[PDB]
mmCIF file of C-alpha atoms in Angstrom:
data_model
loop_
_atom_site.group_PDB
_atom_site.id
_atom_site.type_symbol
_atom_site.label_atom_id
_atom_site.label_comp_id
_atom_site.label_asym_id
_atom_site.label_seq_id
_atom_site.Cartn_x
_atom_site.Cartn_y
_atom_site.Cartn_z
ATOM 1 C CA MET A 742 6.738 -11.153 30.697
ATOM 2 C CA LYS A 743 9.482 -10.798 28.092
ATOM 3 C CA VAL A 744 9.617 -7.478 26.242
ATOM 4 C CA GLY A 745 11.277 -6.524 22.963
ATOM 5 C CA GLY A 746 13.546 -8.675 20.825
ATOM 6 C CA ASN A 747 16.791 -10.325 21.895
ATOM 7 C CA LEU A 748 19.946 -8.252 22.384
ATOM 8 C CA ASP A 749 22.215 -10.743 20.624
ATOM 9 C CA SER A 750 22.093 -13.902 18.509
ATOM 10 C CA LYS A 751 23.136 -17.151 20.183
ATOM 11 C CA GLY A 752 22.185 -20.807 19.801
ATOM 12 C CA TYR A 753 22.407 -24.214 21.449
ATOM 13 C CA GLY A 754 23.721 -27.307 19.687
ATOM 14 C CA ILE A 755 24.511 -30.991 20.092
ATOM 15 C CA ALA A 756 28.134 -31.401 21.174
ATOM 16 C CA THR A 757 30.238 -34.311 19.929
ATOM 17 C CA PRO A 758 33.933 -35.145 20.537
ATOM 18 C CA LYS A 759 36.251 -33.748 17.856
ATOM 19 C CA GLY A 760 36.550 -36.222 14.995
ATOM 20 C CA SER A 761 33.707 -38.458 16.148
ATOM 21 C CA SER A 762 31.666 -40.903 14.075
ATOM 22 C CA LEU A 763 28.355 -39.456 15.267
ATOM 23 C CA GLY A 764 29.531 -36.043 14.083
ATOM 24 C CA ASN A 765 28.052 -35.688 10.601
ATOM 25 C CA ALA A 766 25.011 -37.922 11.274
ATOM 26 C CA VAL A 767 23.816 -35.896 14.273
ATOM 27 C CA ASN A 768 24.436 -32.631 12.422
ATOM 28 C CA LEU A 769 22.140 -33.636 9.566
ATOM 29 C CA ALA A 770 19.650 -35.046 12.070
ATOM 30 C CA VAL A 771 19.269 -31.637 13.710
ATOM 31 C CA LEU A 772 18.685 -29.989 10.331
ATOM 32 C CA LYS A 773 16.142 -32.667 9.438
ATOM 33 C CA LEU A 774 14.254 -32.225 12.709
ATOM 34 C CA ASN A 775 14.035 -28.449 12.293
ATOM 35 C CA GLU A 776 12.754 -28.656 8.718
ATOM 36 C CA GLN A 777 10.098 -31.153 9.796
ATOM 37 C CA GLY A 778 9.084 -28.541 12.355
ATOM 38 C CA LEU A 779 9.783 -31.168 15.000
ATOM 39 C CA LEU A 780 12.064 -28.820 16.942
ATOM 40 C CA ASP A 781 9.488 -26.020 17.006
ATOM 41 C CA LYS A 782 6.911 -28.620 18.021
ATOM 42 C CA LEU A 783 9.001 -29.825 20.960
ATOM 43 C CA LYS A 784 9.508 -26.282 22.249
ATOM 44 C CA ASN A 785 5.779 -25.567 22.062
ATOM 45 C CA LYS A 786 5.209 -28.798 23.982
ATOM 46 C CA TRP A 787 7.371 -27.870 26.972
ATOM 47 C CA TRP A 788 7.088 -24.074 26.951
ATOM 48 C CA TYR A 789 3.498 -23.175 26.059
ATOM 49 C CA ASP A 790 1.465 -26.394 25.861
ATOM 50 C CA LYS A 791 2.840 -27.788 29.122
ATOM 51 C CA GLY A 792 2.797 -24.228 30.447
ATOM 52 C CA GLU A 793 0.564 -23.003 33.258
ATOM 53 C CA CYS A 794 -0.035 -19.530 31.843
ATOM 54 C CA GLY A 795 -2.247 -19.112 28.794
ATOM 55 C CA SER A 796 -4.697 -16.985 30.764
ATOM 56 C CA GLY A 797 -2.427 -14.128 31.842
ATOM 57 C CA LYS A 802 -7.644 -9.832 27.386
ATOM 58 C CA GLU A 803 -8.640 -6.218 26.744
ATOM 59 C CA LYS A 804 -7.201 -3.098 25.110
ATOM 60 C CA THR A 805 -8.070 -0.128 22.897
ATOM 61 C CA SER A 806 -8.618 1.739 26.166
ATOM 62 C CA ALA A 807 -12.131 2.728 27.239
ATOM 63 C CA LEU A 808 -13.993 4.900 29.784
ATOM 64 C CA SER A 809 -13.916 4.774 33.620
ATOM 65 C CA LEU A 810 -17.269 3.056 34.016
ATOM 66 C CA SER A 811 -16.414 1.542 37.417
ATOM 67 C CA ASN A 812 -16.093 4.568 39.706
ATOM 68 C CA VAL A 813 -18.920 6.125 37.725
ATOM 69 C CA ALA A 814 -20.974 3.058 38.586
ATOM 70 C CA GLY A 815 -20.383 3.455 42.293
ATOM 71 C CA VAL A 816 -21.889 6.878 41.716
ATOM 72 C CA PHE A 817 -24.850 5.145 40.114
ATOM 73 C CA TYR A 818 -25.517 2.973 43.123
ATOM 74 C CA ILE A 819 -24.995 5.522 45.877
ATOM 75 C CA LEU A 820 -27.116 7.784 43.701
ATOM 76 C CA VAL A 821 -29.737 5.055 43.909
ATOM 77 C CA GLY A 822 -29.458 5.106 47.678
ATOM 78 C CA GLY A 823 -30.608 8.675 47.338
ATOM 79 C CA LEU A 824 -33.448 7.440 45.148
ATOM 80 C CA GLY A 825 -34.937 4.877 47.507
ATOM 81 C CA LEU A 826 -34.281 7.239 50.390
ATOM 82 C CA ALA A 827 -36.514 9.903 48.879
ATOM 83 C CA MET A 828 -38.877 7.004 48.196
ATOM 84 C CA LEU A 829 -39.555 5.624 51.649
ATOM 85 C CA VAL A 830 -39.211 8.869 53.562
ATOM 86 C CA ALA A 831 -41.704 10.588 51.289
ATOM 87 C CA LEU A 832 -43.963 7.532 51.527
ATOM 88 C CA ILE A 833 -44.341 7.266 55.281
ATOM 89 C CA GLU A 834 -44.545 11.032 55.558
ATOM 90 C CA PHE A 835 -47.360 11.277 53.019
ATOM 91 C CA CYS A 836 -49.498 8.387 54.155
ATOM 92 C CA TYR A 837 -48.434 8.383 57.738
ATOM 93 C CA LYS A 838 -48.218 12.110 58.421
ATOM 94 C CA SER A 839 -51.427 12.971 56.591
ATOM 95 C CA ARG A 840 -53.360 9.741 57.184
ATOM 96 C CA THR B 415 25.204 -48.164 23.784
ATOM 97 C CA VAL B 416 26.033 -44.457 23.466
ATOM 98 C CA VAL B 417 26.704 -42.345 26.559
ATOM 99 C CA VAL B 418 24.631 -39.162 26.412
ATOM 100 C CA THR B 419 25.633 -36.473 28.899
ATOM 101 C CA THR B 420 23.196 -33.730 29.891
ATOM 102 C CA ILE B 421 22.528 -31.164 32.618
ATOM 103 C CA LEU B 422 19.516 -30.834 34.920
ATOM 104 C CA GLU B 423 17.904 -27.638 33.635
ATOM 105 C CA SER B 424 14.159 -27.068 33.303
ATOM 106 C CA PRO B 425 12.442 -27.580 31.055
ATOM 107 C CA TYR B 426 15.168 -29.314 29.034
ATOM 108 C CA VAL B 427 15.958 -32.151 31.441
ATOM 109 C CA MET B 428 13.953 -32.687 34.626
ATOM 110 C CA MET B 429 13.325 -35.512 37.086
ATOM 111 C CA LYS B 430 10.009 -37.210 36.321
ATOM 112 C CA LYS B 431 7.328 -37.217 39.026
ATOM 113 C CA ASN B 432 7.729 -40.834 40.130
ATOM 114 C CA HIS B 433 11.424 -40.984 39.231
ATOM 115 C CA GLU B 434 12.048 -43.084 42.340
ATOM 116 C CA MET B 435 9.846 -45.833 40.903
ATOM 117 C CA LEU B 436 11.599 -45.647 37.532
ATOM 118 C CA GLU B 437 15.042 -46.448 36.133
ATOM 119 C CA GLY B 438 17.250 -45.831 33.108
ATOM 120 C CA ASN B 439 16.159 -43.106 30.701
ATOM 121 C CA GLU B 440 12.538 -43.241 31.863
ATOM 122 C CA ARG B 441 13.605 -41.305 34.960
ATOM 123 C CA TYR B 442 14.020 -38.079 32.995
ATOM 124 C CA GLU B 443 11.703 -35.884 30.926
ATOM 125 C CA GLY B 444 12.075 -32.632 29.004
ATOM 126 C CA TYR B 445 12.935 -30.907 25.734
ATOM 127 C CA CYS B 446 16.415 -32.425 25.482
ATOM 128 C CA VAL B 447 15.152 -35.799 26.698
ATOM 129 C CA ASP B 448 12.795 -35.915 23.717
ATOM 130 C CA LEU B 449 15.425 -34.377 21.443
ATOM 131 C CA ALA B 450 17.731 -37.235 22.427
ATOM 132 C CA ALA B 451 15.262 -39.917 21.352
ATOM 133 C CA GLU B 452 14.727 -38.098 18.055
ATOM 134 C CA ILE B 453 18.446 -37.793 17.325
ATOM 135 C CA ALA B 454 18.972 -41.437 18.276
ATOM 136 C CA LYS B 455 16.176 -42.486 15.921
ATOM 137 C CA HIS B 456 17.598 -40.691 12.885
ATOM 138 C CA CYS B 457 21.172 -41.734 13.673
ATOM 139 C CA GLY B 458 20.208 -45.257 14.716
ATOM 140 C CA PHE B 459 21.711 -45.983 18.124
ATOM 141 C CA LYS B 460 20.811 -46.879 21.701
ATOM 142 C CA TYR B 461 21.743 -44.438 24.455
ATOM 143 C CA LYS B 462 21.955 -43.985 28.221
ATOM 144 C CA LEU B 463 21.007 -40.581 29.628
ATOM 145 C CA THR B 464 23.506 -39.488 32.281
ATOM 146 C CA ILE B 465 23.697 -36.298 34.341
ATOM 147 C CA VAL B 466 27.045 -34.495 34.402
ATOM 148 C CA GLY B 467 28.916 -34.829 37.695
ATOM 149 C CA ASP B 468 29.836 -31.276 38.683
ATOM 150 C CA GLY B 469 26.606 -30.098 37.055
ATOM 151 C CA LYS B 470 28.324 -27.446 34.956
ATOM 152 C CA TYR B 471 28.048 -26.679 31.237
ATOM 153 C CA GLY B 472 31.523 -26.164 29.795
ATOM 154 C CA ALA B 473 34.148 -23.742 31.072
ATOM 155 C CA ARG B 474 37.947 -23.731 31.229
ATOM 156 C CA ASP B 475 39.825 -22.969 34.446
ATOM 157 C CA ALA B 476 42.624 -20.585 33.456
ATOM 158 C CA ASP B 477 45.160 -22.076 35.873
ATOM 159 C CA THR B 478 44.704 -25.846 35.604
ATOM 160 C CA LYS B 479 43.576 -25.439 31.989
ATOM 161 C CA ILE B 480 41.005 -28.163 32.658
ATOM 162 C CA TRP B 481 37.553 -28.391 31.083
ATOM 163 C CA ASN B 482 34.568 -28.983 33.361
ATOM 164 C CA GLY B 483 30.935 -29.997 32.966
ATOM 165 C CA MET B 484 29.604 -31.687 29.841
ATOM 166 C CA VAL B 485 32.196 -30.148 27.529
ATOM 167 C CA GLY B 486 34.761 -31.666 29.871
ATOM 168 C CA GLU B 487 33.280 -35.163 29.927
ATOM 169 C CA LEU B 488 33.464 -35.048 26.127
ATOM 170 C CA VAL B 489 37.130 -34.085 25.830
ATOM 171 C CA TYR B 490 38.213 -36.662 28.415
ATOM 172 C CA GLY B 491 36.205 -39.532 26.937
ATOM 173 C CA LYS B 492 33.633 -39.749 29.722
ATOM 174 C CA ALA B 493 30.728 -39.369 27.288
ATOM 175 C CA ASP B 494 30.086 -39.911 23.577
ATOM 176 C CA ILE B 495 27.726 -36.993 22.990
ATOM 177 C CA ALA B 496 26.199 -33.977 24.736
ATOM 178 C CA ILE B 497 22.492 -33.256 24.299
ATOM 179 C CA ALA B 498 21.664 -30.182 26.371
ATOM 180 C CA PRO B 499 21.261 -26.385 26.173
ATOM 181 C CA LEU B 500 24.983 -26.085 25.434
ATOM 182 C CA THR B 501 25.845 -22.683 23.972
ATOM 183 C CA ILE B 502 27.901 -22.718 20.774
ATOM 184 C CA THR B 503 30.955 -20.648 21.695
ATOM 185 C CA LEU B 504 34.289 -20.155 19.927
ATOM 186 C CA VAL B 505 36.232 -21.347 22.973
ATOM 187 C CA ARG B 506 34.359 -24.661 22.808
ATOM 188 C CA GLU B 507 34.226 -25.082 19.029
ATOM 189 C CA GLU B 508 38.014 -25.377 19.222
ATOM 190 C CA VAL B 509 38.008 -28.470 21.441
ATOM 191 C CA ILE B 510 34.731 -30.139 20.434
ATOM 192 C CA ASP B 511 32.283 -30.215 17.526
ATOM 193 C CA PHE B 512 28.947 -28.398 17.513
ATOM 194 C CA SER B 513 26.078 -29.426 15.258
ATOM 195 C CA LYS B 514 23.929 -26.699 13.716
ATOM 196 C CA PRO B 515 21.816 -24.803 16.283
ATOM 197 C CA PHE B 516 18.662 -26.642 17.347
ATOM 198 C CA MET B 517 17.392 -23.503 19.081
ATOM 199 C CA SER B 518 18.334 -19.873 18.434
ATOM 200 C CA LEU B 519 18.191 -17.491 21.397
ATOM 201 C CA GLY B 520 19.702 -14.398 23.001
ATOM 202 C CA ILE B 521 19.547 -11.963 25.915
ATOM 203 C CA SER B 522 16.075 -10.669 26.778
ATOM 204 C CA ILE B 523 14.355 -8.314 29.224
ATOM 205 C CA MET B 524 12.031 -9.398 32.038
ATOM 206 C CA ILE B 525 9.564 -7.029 33.693
ATOM 207 C CA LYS B 526 6.538 -7.466 35.948
ATOM 208 C CA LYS B 527 3.589 -8.426 33.709
ATOM 209 C CA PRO B 528 1.878 -5.200 34.618
ATOM 210 C CA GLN B 529 -1.543 -4.867 36.173
ATOM 211 C CA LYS B 530 -3.303 -2.311 34.010
ATOM 212 C CA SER B 531 -6.342 -2.115 36.304
ATOM 213 C CA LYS B 532 -6.677 -0.283 39.622
ATOM 214 C CA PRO B 533 -10.321 0.808 39.835
ATOM 215 C CA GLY B 534 -11.325 2.657 42.983
ATOM 216 C CA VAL B 535 -14.651 3.990 44.194
ATOM 217 C CA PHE B 536 -14.377 7.687 44.072
ATOM 218 C CA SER B 537 -11.257 8.153 42.432
ATOM 219 C CA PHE B 538 -14.341 9.225 40.659
ATOM 220 C CA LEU B 539 -14.133 12.032 43.169
ATOM 221 C CA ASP B 540 -10.399 12.132 43.724
ATOM 222 C CA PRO B 541 -9.571 15.152 41.512
ATOM 223 C CA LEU B 542 -10.973 16.875 44.612
ATOM 224 C CA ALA B 543 -9.934 16.080 48.178
ATOM 225 C CA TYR B 544 -11.882 15.135 51.309
ATOM 226 C CA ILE C 495 33.883 -19.677 -1.767
ATOM 227 C CA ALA C 496 30.376 -18.212 -1.617
ATOM 228 C CA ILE C 497 29.751 -15.101 0.478
ATOM 229 C CA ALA C 498 26.088 -14.168 0.093
ATOM 230 C CA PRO C 499 22.650 -14.568 1.720
ATOM 231 C CA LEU C 500 22.788 -18.296 0.970
ATOM 232 C CA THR C 501 20.247 -20.228 3.033
ATOM 233 C CA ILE C 502 21.586 -23.243 4.925
ATOM 234 C CA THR C 503 19.429 -26.096 3.632
ATOM 235 C CA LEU C 504 19.772 -29.869 3.978
ATOM 236 C CA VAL C 505 19.763 -30.350 0.204
ATOM 237 C CA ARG C 506 22.816 -28.084 -0.041
ATOM 238 C CA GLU C 507 24.658 -29.227 3.086
ATOM 239 C CA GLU C 508 24.988 -32.576 1.313
ATOM 240 C CA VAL C 509 26.983 -31.215 -1.630
ATOM 241 C CA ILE C 510 28.796 -28.263 -0.039
ATOM 242 C CA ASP C 511 29.904 -27.038 3.386
ATOM 243 C CA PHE C 512 28.117 -24.317 5.347
ATOM 244 C CA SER C 513 29.835 -22.301 8.056
ATOM 245 C CA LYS C 514 27.843 -21.377 11.156
ATOM 246 C CA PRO C 515 25.028 -18.876 10.459
ATOM 247 C CA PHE C 516 26.203 -15.271 10.180
ATOM 248 C CA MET C 517 22.596 -14.066 10.282
ATOM 249 C CA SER C 518 19.533 -15.825 11.697
ATOM 250 C CA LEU C 519 16.188 -15.079 10.044
ATOM 251 C CA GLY C 520 12.770 -16.460 9.133
ATOM 252 C CA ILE C 521 9.396 -15.732 7.546
ATOM 253 C CA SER C 522 7.748 -12.480 8.635
ATOM 254 C CA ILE C 523 4.574 -10.466 8.041
ATOM 255 C CA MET C 524 4.404 -7.139 6.199
ATOM 256 C CA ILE C 525 1.463 -4.762 6.584
ATOM 257 C CA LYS C 526 0.621 -1.120 5.869
ATOM 258 C CA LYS C 527 0.831 1.778 8.324
ATOM 259 C CA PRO C 528 -2.500 1.940 10.171
ATOM 260 C CA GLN C 529 -2.668 5.713 10.288
ATOM 261 C CA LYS C 530 -6.198 6.062 8.896
ATOM 262 C CA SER C 531 -9.169 7.759 10.563
ATOM 263 C CA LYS C 532 -12.861 7.899 9.811
ATOM 264 C CA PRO C 533 -15.360 10.232 11.500
ATOM 265 C CA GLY C 534 -18.417 8.175 10.563
ATOM 266 C CA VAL C 535 -21.528 8.681 12.675
ATOM 267 C CA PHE C 536 -21.088 6.022 15.358
ATOM 268 C CA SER C 537 -17.644 7.087 16.567
ATOM 269 C CA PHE C 538 -18.849 10.189 18.359
ATOM 270 C CA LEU C 539 -20.855 8.354 20.969
ATOM 271 C CA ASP C 540 -18.188 5.854 21.707
ATOM 272 C CA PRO C 541 -16.135 7.423 24.560
ATOM 273 C CA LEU C 542 -19.287 6.590 26.471
ATOM 274 C CA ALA C 543 -19.836 2.882 25.995
ATOM 275 C CA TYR C 544 -23.097 1.336 24.782
ATOM 276 C CA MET D 742 6.356 -2.440 8.848
ATOM 277 C CA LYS D 743 7.130 -5.946 10.096
ATOM 278 C CA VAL D 744 4.789 -7.334 12.751
ATOM 279 C CA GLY D 745 5.232 -10.195 15.208
ATOM 280 C CA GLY D 746 8.120 -12.641 15.390
ATOM 281 C CA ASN D 747 9.340 -14.932 12.625
ATOM 282 C CA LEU D 748 7.352 -18.031 11.659
ATOM 283 C CA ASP D 749 10.407 -20.280 11.406
ATOM 284 C CA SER D 750 14.130 -20.339 12.175
ATOM 285 C CA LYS D 751 16.515 -20.106 9.225
ATOM 286 C CA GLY D 752 20.000 -18.698 8.682
ATOM 287 C CA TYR D 753 22.512 -17.692 6.025
ATOM 288 C CA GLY D 754 26.089 -18.955 5.947
ATOM 289 C CA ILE D 755 29.357 -18.860 4.029
ATOM 290 C CA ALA D 756 29.444 -21.723 1.526
ATOM 291 C CA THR D 757 32.680 -23.560 0.755
ATOM 292 C CA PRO D 758 33.343 -26.578 -1.518
ATOM 293 C CA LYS D 759 33.170 -29.910 0.320
ATOM 294 C CA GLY D 760 36.567 -30.747 1.792
ATOM 295 C CA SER D 761 38.083 -27.321 1.178
ATOM 296 C CA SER D 762 41.067 -25.738 2.919
ATOM 297 C CA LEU D 763 39.156 -22.545 3.717
ATOM 298 C CA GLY D 764 36.509 -24.668 5.422
ATOM 299 C CA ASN D 765 37.475 -24.614 9.097
ATOM 300 C CA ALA D 766 39.166 -21.177 8.972
ATOM 301 C CA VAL D 767 36.100 -19.389 7.587
ATOM 302 C CA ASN D 768 33.826 -21.215 10.029
ATOM 303 C CA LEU D 769 35.776 -19.939 13.033
ATOM 304 C CA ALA D 770 36.022 -16.509 11.409
ATOM 305 C CA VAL D 771 32.232 -16.202 11.330
ATOM 306 C CA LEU D 772 31.997 -17.169 15.002
ATOM 307 C CA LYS D 773 34.723 -14.663 15.860
ATOM 308 C CA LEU D 774 32.987 -11.852 13.978
ATOM 309 C CA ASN D 775 29.658 -12.491 15.708
ATOM 310 C CA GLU D 776 31.185 -12.548 19.191
ATOM 311 C CA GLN D 777 32.979 -9.274 18.477
ATOM 312 C CA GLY D 778 29.547 -7.913 17.595
ATOM 313 C CA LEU D 779 30.972 -7.134 14.167
ATOM 314 C CA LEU D 780 28.137 -8.966 12.408
ATOM 315 C CA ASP D 781 25.442 -7.095 14.335
ATOM 316 C CA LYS D 782 27.356 -3.896 13.608
ATOM 317 C CA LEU D 783 27.406 -4.547 9.861
ATOM 318 C CA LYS D 784 23.660 -5.204 9.771
ATOM 319 C CA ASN D 785 22.943 -1.984 11.661
ATOM 320 C CA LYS D 786 25.162 -0.187 9.150
ATOM 321 C CA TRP D 787 23.225 -1.277 6.059
ATOM 322 C CA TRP D 788 19.726 -1.722 7.487
ATOM 323 C CA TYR D 789 19.115 1.088 9.982
ATOM 324 C CA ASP D 790 22.088 3.471 9.862
ATOM 325 C CA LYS D 791 22.162 3.625 6.061
#
């Protein structure tokens, strides 16, 4: 995962031979695409939409319930243990 | 039919799945591949996507004073335009022309997307030892 | 020449010339410091979940 | 406080009359200043430092 903002400000651009005919046209084209949100759209298409990771949530921070819950269960082992042992000793010892 | 030079860098320009069964511009797919079609539509021209030979971006060997990569193929008339993640640098702006940035970026930090969960059993009990 | 926070827009690039951006920006969100606290009557229980 | 990243990508620039003599010079000057980190320095001076 990426953390914090960028350290510097760079930028990619369309390169055209010095003094070319496509020079001004392409320049305006890039500005037009960005204003139409077409550039942002394209990025979303290949970075996030086409991405494989939208799953990788919780927060706020809560209690430990897990380990505690193990205690519940094992604790229950004690329960049923008292249960059967007492049972067969009552009915079986006495009876 | 304009010659568009570009570099193979995901996810800007990548080889399509069945690229062996395809030809021309249909062979490639990516951010720049789509950006090319868009630019060509607003500027009105046909183009042929071509991958730079040496597979470099633009640099300038101090000794030979020769440009390499896409920036090179532009200065020496090999291509008509460069549509790729080419950084806009002063050293390049002197020899070629850069359109306004189509994507602002910078240097970032990458760490291991941390696992915040390590539940045990009795770590419940761990404050005391066996 | 114009040296100010002048936005580089298409409508302007047609009449004048804009140098490369000397400061990239955008639209952001402004909120208020979330420093508040309420004691209520439900909060107490909460360290122990429902 | 500002929260989250920007919603869009904009940018300010130095404006010069179409077909001016200061046109190329200023353009390169801006690029030179940014690479020398002088632009970032100026912002820090007036935004955070000051």
